[PDB]
Symmetry: D3
Subunit: 221 residues, 6 copies
């Protein structure tokens, strides 16, 4: 039983979406996977010696679950997940809703409404038009929004990631008070992934955190 | 700061070892890393749909920490770690000792005595001469012994992997009674790695467990 | 004189642009080059046997200058061209402008204004939100807008590409009446490139021309 | 319709040529394409900056039709072209005839007589035995002889390349007098290709023109 | 007739051996082939300019048969050769027998008994535990044991390689007395291969000959 | 001592030859080496099962020296060999002399006269214009003549290849009478190498021996 020839590592898309919607959903999913892979590599290279790990997860925490989450996002068997473009539950009629989760009856199914195709931006436009990681909402780009949607599925989240703190300040206090629960928090992982990507690639050596802190090479050891 | 050029992903060896000791220690270390890589790939492919995972870690456990442990073993920064072939602390004099951990003063160093160079075996002789995973000792091969030595180091173990169960029966009971401490038990990880390697590579489809269980393709779904 | 070692086939950018402007200008330039490359490949493969070539350049025209223009764009030498983000001529105050050519004194420099970073789009959103090649303006996307700035330059334009017909109807009339000037007209080449890219990649077999004409495999022979 | 899968870029040979005829003619046919590829690369790299372009096509002529002419030979569909070794029109009897074009009835077919397999030379022997580019006939080698046959075919010539000047002096006068017809003149292109190959590959930095001119690196700018 | 497709360059193994025996026999065979390849490369690089060649084959001998033998071992047609794990002649009952050749009736077949799977070593342990090329037996390792079996087969030995001198002293005397017969001698070839591998790879610059001699770079000229 | 980075496997040419003699001598040497490589591959694949081996070397001869000679020609250290275009011994004044060996004073030097650049053919014209391996001279092509010159050097011939039979009939009789001496005969090796190449590459399945024998696939077993 060669299981290396049956391994699917990309997110499937249903046939409800036409060519135009498929073209942009594929790019968004690929960008989300690229962000997750970079976060995994940064964690593996540094650990708790980097100042970004120490401020989102704890001063002396172990980096095993953190790398495992992004490893599951990057490489795993996505043979049951399906993304649909059809409103099968009558919920896109709400205000400001760009998608939703089908629930417990269909735990590996997600629906995308038409607001996503007009409001979401791409990774080449990061830290532009006044965007900052700590003062803007995390769902402005395709990568952050789709990462947030990934934690709901049964094959990725596995019913352990939840919402314990949502605002930036609450995330910062969770990092220092309850270090066990701030590795399974939805917002901490997305903040970390968005913060370490703008420091290595977008603006090397500076980033766009926008909260009044600057990190040098001497802080990484 | 281009940190992708300073990344060292192999285990450094000291100069106390002459040519014929280096020749064998390097091969042993490479085999241990290969075993870790295969275990991580199997876990990512299957998760809790595998009978081996289900029997060593729990019926409905989440696979995020096992993947992280094996990924830390495979790829991370091995710059502070050193393997020595010199008896600085004078402990190789004991009977049946093939090495030891230098302690809390030097938490990233370990000593290899001369017994390792006359007793340890290679991965091509697995499941031969009457060897079985569940009835023989785990340190007979280079890969298992070196995996056991890896968990002691501060840059890999991170002071979370301990000895909660040592025998096969205790390992099987702890997987069903206390599934939170099983993902950080030393022997459970090595048993899982050896079992899945013997099932996938050495004797494809049968394995060499030796306790009256046979698994088919229908048990993986 | 090994001239293959100092051959530059990419458009250089000045140091007056910061990181965020560089990140988007580079992507726009690469997209324009990719569009030109696809147009050249389609022309070489088919010639006057394709209906797009026939409708934009003439029924029995020869395809040599058309191939040469796109080949000059893709792979000429670009060591004296510069793109600047600095307003050195006080021309940004005019309403609606997104950039301009520096003139005949400096016949190889172009200035990109801050309006280009708010409105231009990317190739993955082609034929969406009601965009049609026939009825919309050519400078909505990065590639179509940047390709028209290349014909102004001395190295690429060579003072032979001019404005002989601007609207869609005039472009369609020039192709049939004056076939000699059609291959040197600025808008005809951009229309041809956009049409063939939309037909071959974005929506395979349909395109998004939006003027009531549909082409099948039998028109290509 | 995937038109990149059935793209033919070599010249087909009929079954009337036996083993040795095929062996020699295929090599002769590929050498001409190599010559055309080098000429195209030189034109793209320099343009009117090189002193070889200026003396054959004009002091300030634009280089797009030349690039297109050579790129048509290098890469284009050749599925309708056939080379035959059979004398069907009863013409391989005139003195000094090495082949002929089948005419307007079959405008994509060529016949090769038996003098070609006795009197044609290869590119490794260029500029030897007293051969000079300007003082010798242009059909002494396989590449130069096949290039002028390529211009007669409907698919590569397209009824635009003719004979407006045949000797070296007339070729040199046409460049300065009538620059519009120099770029579609049969002999100027072959002279240019031979010159730039001999200058760059055969005798690097000198060439074998043999007319009393020497060009240095200072002339190329 | 394409004879390059049905070309077998590895040694086939029969179905009498189960998985455990197959796993070790294949590794031994590939190690023997690697040793032969290194010996051929050393001979090609140096010839009679190396001190090992002059002492195993003669001071002024020609290296043609020597390189031919190892080239035959490395790459040839091993299509009629078979290795079996069954005892079809009842000869493994003798003491100290690790295998035998099936004889003249079956000239391309050989039997492997069970001692081979308990007493043979690997190339990573060369020159260790007191092993010495000059003083130990040549059949301790898999490679040196299988090389001696290769000379018995009809298609690798071809009825010319025999036993003329067995001990080290006899080999050293035959080298200088009869240089014609010491190029088709089993032990001479095996000793030469083991020595040039141990000098070049295992302990670079020193080797493990263990007979009171040592060579430097000044002896290779 | 890394001797793999100091390995020269091509034939050096002096600076006496100008730009146009180097171009042809280099190609001739490459073609000779390619012919030797093909002969080695044919010998390795078949041995004494092919009818070409059996008629030139013997009905049941062993193929070790034959493969070693061609292996020495293909890959060895050509660091003391030199080819010169300057007449130092005043011997080209003879008639029909295309080169000569410098003698025992300089055992690794060869001189090429000017007939070689006027009367030598290439491998793409084999079996053409009435050439047959059996009835024509062996020094008509670059490959055969240079192969003949290689056996004189002390680093390749090694003072064992001589002239024992020169005509085709004597060569045919030597194989049946004295098989020991027809493996170090100069003309037998050249006749074998030309014949197997003509049969395999030039005219697949037939060849151009021109003697009255035709070999089928059933003769190779």
């Amino acid at each position: 039983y060669d299981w290396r020839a049956d391994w699917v590592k990309g997110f499937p898309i249903d046939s409800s979406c036409n060519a135009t919607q498929y073209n942009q959903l594929s790019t968004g999913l690929q960008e989300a996977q690229l962000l997750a892979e970079h976060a995994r590599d940064h964690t593996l290279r540094f650990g708790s010696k980097s100042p970004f790990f120490r401020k989102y997860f704890g001063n002396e925490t172990a980096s095993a679950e953190v790398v495992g989450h992004f490893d599951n996002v990057v490489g795993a068997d996505k043979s049951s997940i399906l993304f649909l473009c059809d409103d099968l539950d009558d919920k896109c009629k709400n205000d400001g809703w760009a998608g939703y989760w089908r629930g417990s009856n269909h735990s590996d199914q997600t629906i995308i409404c038409d607001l996503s195709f007009v409001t979401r931006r791409y990774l080449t436009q990061l830290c532009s038009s006044g965007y900052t990681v700590s003062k803007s909402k995390t769902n402005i780009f395709w990568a952050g929004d789709l990462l947030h949607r990934f934690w709901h599925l049964k094959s990725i989240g596995q019913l352990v990631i939840e919402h314990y703190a949502d605002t930036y300040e609450e995330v910062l206090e969770l990092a220092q008070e309850n270090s066990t629960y701030a590795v399974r928090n939805s917002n901490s992982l997305i903040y970390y992934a968005l913060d370490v990507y703008a420091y290595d690639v977008t603006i090397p050596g500076e980033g766009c955190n926008g909260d009044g802190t600057s990190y040098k090479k001497s802080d990484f050891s």
